[PDB]
Amino acid sequence: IPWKVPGLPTPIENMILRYVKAKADWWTNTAHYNRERIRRGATVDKTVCKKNLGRLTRLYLKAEQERQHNYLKDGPYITAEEAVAVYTTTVHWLESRRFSPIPFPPLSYKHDTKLLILALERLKEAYSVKSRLNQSQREELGLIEQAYDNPHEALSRIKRHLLTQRA
């Protein structure tokens, strides 16, 4: 995140920036070296493993943001000719197969309740009860129970979202 204290004199700000740069370099290098150790195979402890996991998570997220901004700067790496080539290949294959596009699920679909039940069961399966579930997980369990209770209203919500939601 951007760090700029308006009232800090610029020489002190420069010194702090140099400090942060040096510490960041050491942080990155030590995280990488420790991960090489752990991966290659060395005896370590839970605290070190967890701290290294945190550091690696932060570094990976930084790299991913770099990737996204580089994409936005360099535009699509796939040229228009390549795009049209693959698109034409796909349409030719689908025409050959004689494929019929999947329609938007009708209002009175025969199996919609079956599909909803399967989805809710799959969502429930992800709870190997440890007796300690956080707020969001317990809330999702409550929502799943509500959908189980009143299938049709949940279907109406789902279709509404699929038709309009984009944010």
């Binding site: 994409y71 936005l72 700067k73 535009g75 228009a80 795009a83 019929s100 596009p101 329609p103 938007f104």
Partner: protein, 34 residues
């Protein structure tokens, strides 16, 4: 001066989308509901 890097990327995205739409217009059996 400066460069608005995002603008050239957006232009290229729009060019690709326009060409793909050009191609897609020929394809017929597509489905869409109101």
């Amino acid at each position: 001066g400066e460069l608005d890097m995002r603008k050239i990327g957006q232009a290229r995205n729009t060019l690709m989308d326009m060409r793909l739409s050009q191609v897609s217009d020929s394809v017929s059996g597509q489905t869409v509901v109101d």
